[PDB]
Amino acid sequence: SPELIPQLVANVTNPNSTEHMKESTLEAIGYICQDIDPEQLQDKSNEILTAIIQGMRKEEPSNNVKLAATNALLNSLEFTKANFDKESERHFIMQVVCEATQCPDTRVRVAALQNLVKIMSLYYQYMETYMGPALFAITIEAMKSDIDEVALQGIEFWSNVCDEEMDLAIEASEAAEQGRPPEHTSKFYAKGALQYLVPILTQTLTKQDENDDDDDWNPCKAAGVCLMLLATCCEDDIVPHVLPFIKEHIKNPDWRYRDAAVMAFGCILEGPEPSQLKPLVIQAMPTLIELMKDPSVVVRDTAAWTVGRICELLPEAAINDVYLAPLLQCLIEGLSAEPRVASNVCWAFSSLAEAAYEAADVADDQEEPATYCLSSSFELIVQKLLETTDRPDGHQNNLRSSAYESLMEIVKNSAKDCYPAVQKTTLVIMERLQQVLQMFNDLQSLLCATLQNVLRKVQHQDALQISDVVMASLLRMFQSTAGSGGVQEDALMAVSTLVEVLGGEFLKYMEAFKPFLGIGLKNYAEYQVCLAAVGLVGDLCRALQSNIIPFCDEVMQLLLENLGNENVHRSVKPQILSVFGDIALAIGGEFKKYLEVVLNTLQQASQAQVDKSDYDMVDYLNELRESCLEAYTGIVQGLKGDQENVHPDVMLVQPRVEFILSFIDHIAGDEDHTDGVVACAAGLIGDLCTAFGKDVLKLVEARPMIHELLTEGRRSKTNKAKTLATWATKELRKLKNQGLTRVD
Amino acid sequence: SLEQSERRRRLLELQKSKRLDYVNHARRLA
């Protein structure tokens, strides 16, 4: 900064500067610290702090100048690292901040505590046990204040202390395992303040905003998060401090205390040893079932969340031959409650399904369990979740997404005596495939997983009926609604799943789908959709095999036009080349129609080169080369066939063998080749051996680097290169030893 | 989104392995 920063600093340090001059400049200084990177500001940090501390000092009469300077400190902490390093400069900064927290003005008071929070978040290691009680006294008093903006800073401070000390606990745990001293050692401030922290936080849980709002962030919510972070930070230590509050207020006539009891209990469910928490959950269960039917909307919401958190963190307790029946019964009714409650109920069911599935007995010769502890309730709970789906208020609290997520999870994690209900409800879900698609992000992957799951375990004719529904929904989708880029991609990946499971039986749907597959391959602008469409063709090649023949003319046309287009993202090219191999492998001799142009494309793509410097392009070249090798492999094998002798059709690839082996030889000579490329090269060499015979051996032996590439492959770490390089060596050895008479 | 990238990578790997299984069947391996 040529002259600017010094000008600002001088206008604060100057004793003749007016109240306006100092105050306006510190705000200007403050915003500058929010702008530039430490590149310029770390030289000036010595001078910027001089002006900042000058404005915060006890001796400054104006509170406006104090606030401006205290706010400026907050923004400058990103590069006070070198100043915090020396203890005397640290002693001065800390004293100024601590004295600023005692200022009669509230605006300064809050900003001074904001500093303690951020300093704690950044420089934990530089805080000595010396500062321990000093910081404890200021932040605890901040917590006990009637002003909410003051209370929030006191709570956030310890939440940040917990975050830092949890990472240090992790740091110490791995250091012990490895037999090392931890790089940094925890000072356990949270453990030492826990006695005093919990009574305050439990009491702050009683100050809920009766006029409820999710956007608003207040001391009551912060307290809940704080107790939760204290539970994971201090583990079993927290239990004796929170439990007497819970037990005393769980049946308080005042809803605010009753709500605090269920919250506090829910907050301590992770951290302490599950062996302590399980009997406590069992003890609290009857009361928990009562609190589900609480008159107060607030208590129910917290009760559902507590139950929903029990099911996730402590599954063995949620399943109980004693309380399961009344638990499931009240969760059913909870789906008819407000979205605040019903969403957590959905979450509870999903965890219960996983819990009941994991626990279920599976014969050690069988795939799935015959029965599980949700079988009696299965049909009822899966029906009420679908009705929860039809709720016109499903948008709020994300009820609709929670209901579908449950429905899927329940259907996935199910016993055999639930299969009729599984099949019925999964038909309904697939009927609404469009709005499930157009609906967080894992929901689509979980939908593909469940569809994959159901199709495999249900009776074959029932899987065909589900497949009929899925395709009926997708074909209606494409033909009705416009077609969003993210939506189409998810729709294609959905098709991929069905194809991979159905195999050759997908041929039913091939007619009605081919236009929409074509739209995907024609989508140059949104290449992610394109890549998915390219991927699907390969899946179709493995599924339909030679039955894809009457669909190849068009597909091949689209794939070749895609390659000829100069504006298609580079990711698409190698995938199309790979899929040429899948086509040739599927259609066999029928490929002769496309052969010339494909071989000419592969030849051009193989000779493509990028410069050594570009780290990204070198990774791309190998991805392109891998696809080139794969393509040839699919072509050589495809025209060869699976018979006794080689089909004469491969002799059309014979003129290309010289180029192919030169391409492999050039790959071998390149030190920067990948294990995937080496594997694909070794694979191709073996293929050439089986197709063309002893001549290949001679041409391989004349290119000595190929011998080295094979040696490298058999010794490689990966399973792919190991297997294929051994196979090519074996195939080359067969050609070496053929026509040799054996003797005893 | 980070969730959509991993959803994309997982499918490509699966398609690549299924391709390898089909070719190695034609090659007669393992």
From Swiss-Prot, chain A:
PTM annotation, UniProt: Mono-ADP-ribosylated by PARP16.
Residues modified as N6-acetyllysine: 86, 698, 730
Any one GO MF annotation of this record: nuclear import signal receptor activity
Entry keywords, A to Z: Acetylation, ADP-ribosylation, Cytoplasm, Host-virus interaction, Nucleus, Phosphoprotein, Protein transport, Repeat, Transport
Native source species: Homo sapiens
Domain of life where this protein originates: Eukaryota
Sequence ranges of the HEAT repeats: 4-35, 45-77, 87-122, 128-177, 189-235, 239-269, 277-313, 324-360, 375-412, 419-455, 463-502, 507-544, 549-587, 595-639, 649-692, 694-736
PANTHER family, per database record: IMPORTIN BETA
Principal place of residence: cytoplasm
Record localization: Cytoplasm; Nucleus envelope
Assigned protein family: Belongs to the importin beta family. Importin beta-1 subfamily.
UniProt xrefs under PROSITE patterns: HEAT_REPEAT, IMPORTIN_B_NT
UniProt keyword annotation of Nucleus present: yes
Function: Functions in nuclear protein import, either in association with an adapter protein, like an importin-alpha subunit, which binds to nuclear localization signals (NLS) in cargo substrates, or by acting as autonomous nuclear transport receptor. Acting autonomously, serves itself as NLS receptor. Docking of the importin/substrate complex to the nuclear pore complex (NPC) is mediated by KPNB1 through binding to nucleoporin FxFG repeats and the complex is subsequently translocated through the pore by an energy requiring, Ran-dependent mechanism. (Microbial infection) In case of HIV-1 infection, binds and mediates the nuclear import of HIV-1 Rev.
Subunit structure: Forms a complex with an importin alpha subunit. Interacts with XPO1. Forms a heterodimer with IPO7. The KPNB1/IPO7 heterodimer interacts with H1 histone. Interacts with SNUPN. Interacts with H2A, H2B, H3 and H4 histones. Component of an import snRNP complex composed of KPNB1, SNUPN, SMN1 and ZNF259. Component of a nuclear export receptor complex composed of KPNB1, Ran, SNUPN and XPO1. Interacts with SRY. Interacts with PRKCI/atypical protein kinase C iota. Interacts with KPNA2. Interacts with KPNA7. Interacts with SNAI1 (via zinc fingers) and SNAI2 (via zinc fingers). (Microbial infection) Interacts with HIV-1 Rev and Tat.
Listed GO CC annotations: cytoplasm; cytoplasmic stress granule; cytosol; endoplasmic reticulum tubular network; extracellular exosome; extracellular region; ficolin-1-rich granule lumen; membrane
Span list, region Ran-GTP binding: 209-294
Alphabetical GO biological process terms: astral microtubule organization; establishment of mitotic spindle localization; mitotic chromosome movement towards spindle pole; mitotic metaphase chromosome alignment; mitotic spindle assembly; NLS-bearing protein import into nucleus; positive regulation of cholesterol biosynthetic process; protein import into nucleus
Region (IAB-binding): 204-217
Name assigned to this protein: Importin subunit beta-1
Positions of the UniProt region annotated as Essential for high affinity interaction with RPL23A: 161-337
Gene label: KPNB1
Swiss-Prot record, chain B:
Subcellular location: Nucleus; Cytoplasm
Superkingdom field: Eukaryota
Role, per record: Functions as an U snRNP-specific nuclear import adapter. Involved in the trimethylguanosine (m3G)-cap-dependent nuclear import of U snRNPs. Binds specifically to the terminal m3G-cap U snRNAs.
Family from the record: Belongs to the snurportin family.
Disease: Muscular dystrophy, limb-girdle, autosomal recessive 29: An autosomal recessive form of limb girdle muscular dystrophy, a group of genetically heterogeneous muscular disorders that share proximal muscle weakness as the major attribute. Most limb girdle muscular dystrophies present with elevated creatinine kinase and myopathic electromyographic features. Disease is usually progressive to a variable degree, ranging from minor disability to complete inability to ambulate, and can involve the large proximal muscles, as well as axial and facial muscles.
Subunit details: Component of an import snRNP complex composed of KPNB1, SNUPN, SMN1 and ZNF259. Component of a nuclear export receptor complex composed of KPNB1, Ran, SNUPN and XPO1. Found in a trimeric export complex with SNUPN, Ran and XPO1. Interacts (via IBB domain) with KPNB1; the interaction is direct. Interacts with DDX20, IPO7, SMN1, SNRPB and XPO1. Interacts directly with XPO1. Its interaction with XPO1 and binding to m3G-cap U snRNPs appears to be mutually exclusive. Can form homomers.
Protein name per UniProt: Snurportin-1
